Amino acid sequence: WNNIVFYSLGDVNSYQGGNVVITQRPQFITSWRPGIATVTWNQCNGPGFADGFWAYYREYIAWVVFPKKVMTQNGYPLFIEVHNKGSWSEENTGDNDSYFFLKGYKWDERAFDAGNLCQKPGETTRLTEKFDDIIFKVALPADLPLGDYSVKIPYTSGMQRHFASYLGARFKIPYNVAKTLPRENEMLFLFKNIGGCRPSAQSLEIKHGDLSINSANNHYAAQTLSVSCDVPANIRFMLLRNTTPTYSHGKKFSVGLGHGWDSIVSVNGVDTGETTMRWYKAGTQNLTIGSRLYGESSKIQPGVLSGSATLLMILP
Amino acid sequence: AVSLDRTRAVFDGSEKSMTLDISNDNKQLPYLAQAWIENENQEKIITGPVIATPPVQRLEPGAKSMVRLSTTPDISKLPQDRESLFYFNLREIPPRSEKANVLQIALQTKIKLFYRPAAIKTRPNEVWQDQLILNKVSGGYRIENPTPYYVTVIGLGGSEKQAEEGEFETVMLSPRSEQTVKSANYNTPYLSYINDYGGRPVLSFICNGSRCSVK
Amino acid sequence: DVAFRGNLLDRPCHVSGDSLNKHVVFKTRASRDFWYPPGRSPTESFVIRLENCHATAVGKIVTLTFKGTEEAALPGHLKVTGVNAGRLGIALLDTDGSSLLKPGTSHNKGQGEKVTGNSLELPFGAYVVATPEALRTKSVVPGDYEATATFELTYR
Amino acid sequence: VEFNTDVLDAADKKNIDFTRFSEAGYVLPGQYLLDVIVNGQSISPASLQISFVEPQSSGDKAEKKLPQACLTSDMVRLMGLTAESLDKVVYWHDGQCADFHGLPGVDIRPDTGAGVLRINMPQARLEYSDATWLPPSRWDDGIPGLMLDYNLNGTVSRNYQGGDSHQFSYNGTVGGNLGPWRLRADYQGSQEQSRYNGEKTTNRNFTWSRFYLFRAIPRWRANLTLGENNINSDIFRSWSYTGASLESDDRMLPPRLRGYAPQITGIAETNARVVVSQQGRVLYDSMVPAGPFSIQDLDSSVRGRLDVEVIEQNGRKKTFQVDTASVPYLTRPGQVRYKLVSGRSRGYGHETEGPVFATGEASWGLSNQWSLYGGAVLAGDYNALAAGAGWDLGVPGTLSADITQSVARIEGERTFQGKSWRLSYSKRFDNADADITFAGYRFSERNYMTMEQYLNARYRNDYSSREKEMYTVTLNKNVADWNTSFNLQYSRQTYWDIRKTDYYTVSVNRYFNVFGLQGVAVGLSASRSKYLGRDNDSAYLRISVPLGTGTASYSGSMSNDRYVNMAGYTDTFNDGLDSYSLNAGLNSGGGLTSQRQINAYYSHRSPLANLSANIASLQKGYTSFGVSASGGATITGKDAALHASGGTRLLVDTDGVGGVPVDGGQVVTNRWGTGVVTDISSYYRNTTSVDLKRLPDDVEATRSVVESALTEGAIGYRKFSVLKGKRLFAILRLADGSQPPFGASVTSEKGRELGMVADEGLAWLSGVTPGETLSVNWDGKIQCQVNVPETAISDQQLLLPCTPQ
């Protein structure tokens, strides 16, 4: 006869992932912890009790089921994959949702004890087994917004016991009932996304001259801001209004600089206020923040013009 | 002929060199503008406190050029609790024509260079002329300057048609001082002035008989 | 990233655009017109253009005064600087055409200043005259003579 | 033309020269302050000294010449010139006018009128040096010092077995920069404790994950790495090792040169004006040289049609479209990319050893838009030669292929010879926007053996999971006015002694809006893994609705008969630094249980360190409240500091001021007078300026922008002349009642200059705290002391007494 009783761990471990970039992949340690554990899958085909007077063979194999893809709290896949699998034996890698790790540490020994060979689902036993470590790098996807994340990965990691009665017995749990196991063990990990997109200047000073009023009625001042990426995202930036505009110039994004002097902002030549750019690979691009100083209804009042127009880059 | 965008150049004590651009409105014959900086009693002090960096410079017809004013230890050898006055003037030399018995005219300009120390450096829209007061004299008026900056009055009047359009001689004001000015008595005299920037705002004075200022 | 836009600005107190090549000439002889009693050439009317940003007045914006070298033999005149060194002088008249003003006095404001729109035209008259010590003795010679007068526009 | 200088210039002649400028249009030699422009950009933002003097070097009979810009050795050192290859500026002394006659095509037109000094030079005479990239001769390397980067997340827990709450994470990254040699050691562990009624278990695991040294090399433009790291999944998979690694970097290379794009070739007639637009934006607009030309400097991000247009001097036109490939191994025509790596193979333990190897993997492209890429892996018991080329055919797409003849001599007397080949394909921009981003086909054998299979076969006896075939097609499709990102892909891998594994993953990023603002995103996906009998139909759904002040999210997922839904409310606060979410969920799994998840967080990006708290609870696991701290320090600098890192950090030094705000990550300083900005990239132009509007009223910043370019993992020095205090005039009254002469340097006890006296006690002292004693120093020695009261406010002329000692 061949009896199998699954006994799953109850460890809830945490780790702060830090502040990473989209192209950077953070590495983490998922340790094996010999703590409190609970039965999740019970079977009885042979006897139900034992007094230790019959011959019965023993084997103990570790069972680690880790997920490949995992959804976020906003619904994004995180392709978690192995660089080094440790001293385990990764098999059945043809599945799409989960890896299957194994370790044969106890596979041939004869016991002489009085025990319960098939425990009920309301049962707790002792587990003290130091195992090898395992490691993973979170390969982040292409599109991921800014902010903080609270991703939880579903994992069933727990020592099962195989009860048998003959010498040379080899039996593992079938993978579909091993992958249809309950969502017991969680992992509390947080990681901050600083975003793959960033500008290079971080402040824009446009050197425009000490000019006369005739050229102040229509002037052009240009400055180029270089945004450099290594991810194929599709950025979007909003020219946020910060100070008070004076003259209602219609559809054109007027930035009143003060003392009766407005000035529109011309991103890439046209007065759109927002543009649309697609990026396909690693590189950089240029955006000309042009400025036209026609903020005059022929009631001229000269003063120091020092307004502001902050552009914030939001990942859609 | 050359043209100047500044009606009074202001030189703040923070930066050691301001820019001052000139242009060439002529499109037929060139010119060479040479500049120097005088003082209150109007003399060409060649190696004074402030110096124009190009001493003589050729100007193409239709071109433009800048005259920067560098800094020496003698501007530190000036008072810091008040401002300082300087007279920036410049001449133009036209080319010698081939025609005989020709009389030449040089349409030149002299501008007021206002040195402002870094100790009394002002904000971009801080109108210090709001603090100005005017006292009544039996036969005229006297304006007072409590502010440490050089200000200039150009006209006084009761209504908007006679201050800057009447027959009135202007006067220059000095810091922490006063002077008398003969004018007709107005109940609400609005202060018509010219700032360091170049604009000409107007502001009202509401009094109690003898001394007045702003709201 | 904050992209604040800060500047400085001014307004062009300057000359107008109608009369750029202003050089007055004199088609008068020296051996005949300066050997008899009165020694004067005909007056040549020339104007001074002014396109400022405020045409409200004249003395409240521009204090016009003129300088240059003064004639030694003739008080109230300018040096000619040519073949007739000290023998001839430069006269100058105002907008009224009769006030023979001095080399260094300011222009008398309030009269003869027609504000043609936003401009300010100042007509002046100047004719070359001879010094009486060279006129009566008839020591003047015909030739080329180039004089230059400087007009400072010291603003307010 | 001769001028009228004969009348007057002034009262007297200034005796300089008066005819030379008139005929020669000559500039007067003096002290000018010009901006120097080299090929359209600027080598300095606020360039101070440009001297003009008259060259008396060349003797002649006429001796009438023009002056030129007397550039010294420091500004031609920072001009970006390649003085190493052209030593025509090395030998130049500051006494004579610096001629550039030894170089061809160099014209210097000094136009002092516009205030610019334009210098036009050919591209091969100088380095790259644009507006955002400092040249490699000027790299601000690191100062000596160490660094600590902590990541700790402690939390409590609640289970169904009794009572249990004790948990402490332990992550970290230490290291020390010693000149260009940079040490890095990342430690990660955990600390958990369990307290049940009848049992009290605890454990303490802590292990150094990686030990490595890396020194950046500018000459070779590649970073060596000594110590431990990994080899990426390039041809062979991920395999850990310890040793040396001369990897060709790409961040040391300019950002418009990264990746692949072909050089535009052709010889039409003259100095034409090139214009190349990708989607309505010019990527390159300049004047090519006369005759033959080839643009090696354009290697930017382009994945499709690009109408590279040439416009000549007369006005003639020619149009031709060229094609890019974007395959992972073809590079720039003329330059190489390589990986020279060697050492010992790391197993899983920290002290694990193994064989010694010497693997060289390089990629080089000839200039007929073709490229070969080779790999030569050789160890004492295992060799693997990899070679193959990749080339873009243009209009039918692009190809790439390689051969891999690996020989594996195991100790069981079984020599394993395997020749495995794989092919790569991609596709350009179609008119109806069809884009195949990657298309592989991996033909392997029964005897293929890479490095990771040989590592598992040498000491661990693993003999499974080798790929027979692996081929995927990945098309991607975008569409205007619909805004849906369609991307279907299907792969079918086959292992040894295991059957086929067909994959099917489709996705769509819908973008439209109904009763909300534009920016609402809808995500849908469908996954299907096909075995011989089963088909795992998985489907994840995404709904994201932003409203400016709010960003609600909804995520539905289904692994295997488990419909799991979640609804989120993640949003920032009014300042941008903080962010908080509140999210619930439902977990209805196949195992007869319905669970309810609840997750929330509250972050606070403080300038001293990042901090956050998280509420997380589900069914059978409850109320896990935690605190996550993540910050770092930099000791052995000027003074120590605390910050918000994964590499380089710039150290901004503002002495005397406690709370000045710096840009980048809005990092404020400390009581010691220092701060460290962390959101900077390596090798770029870093303009770290203080936010001039949010300064405190007691302090003032004179000059705010300083420039340098830091190396990868370097710490850079930037001094900041700032001042804290009031604006005063101390009218002194000595014991005899006198006033000392000029040069009386009023100095604080910390060693900072405050000002000097002009004539009678009108000394403008700046930056003084109320309640201190200063040191007025004339004749190079201390003579008297003063005493400032607390009562002193700004803009005063207070009666200050000077008590002597």
Numbering used by the authors:
A (entry chain G): 21 to 336
B (entry chain D): 1 to 215
C (entry chain K): 23 to 178
D (entry chain C): 1 to 644, 648 to 808
Paper text:
In the CU pathway, a dedicated chaperone facilitates the folding of pilus subunits in the periplasm and an integral outer membrane (OM) protein termed the usher provides the assembly platform and secretion channel for the pilus fiber. Ushers contain five domains: a central 24-stranded ß-barrel domain that inserts into the OM to form the secretion channel, an internal plug domain that forms the channel gate, a periplasmic N-terminal domain (NTD) that functions in subunit recruitment, and two tandem periplasmic C-terminal domains (CTD1 and CTD2) that function in pilus assembly and secretion. Using cryo-electron microscopy (EM), we determined structures of the activated PapC usher in the process of secreting two- and three-subunit P pilus assembly intermediates.
To generate a two-subunit intermediate, we replaced the PapK NTE with the NTE from PapF (PapKF-NTE) and deleted papE and papF, resulting in a ∆EF P pilus tip fiber composed only of PapK bound to PapG. For the two-subunit ∆EF dataset, starting with over one million particles, after 2D and 3D classifications, we derived two 3D maps, named Conformers II and III, at 3.8 Å and 7.2 Å, respectively. The lectin domain of PapG in Conformers II and III has not yet fully transited through the usher channel and the PapG pilin domain is still located on the periplasmic side of the usher. In Conformers II and III, the PapC plug domain, NTD, and CTDs are resolved in the 3D maps and reside on the periplasmic side of the β-barrel channel. The interactions between PapC CTD2 and PapD are more complicated: in Conformer II, F732 and W767 of CTD2 interact hydrophobically with A119 and I120 of PapD, respectively; in Conformer III, F732 and W767 of CTD2 form hydrophobic interactions with I46, I51, and P73 of PapD. (4) Next, the handover of PapDF from the NTD to the CTDs is initiated by binding of CTD2 to the midpoint of the PapD chaperone (Conformer II).
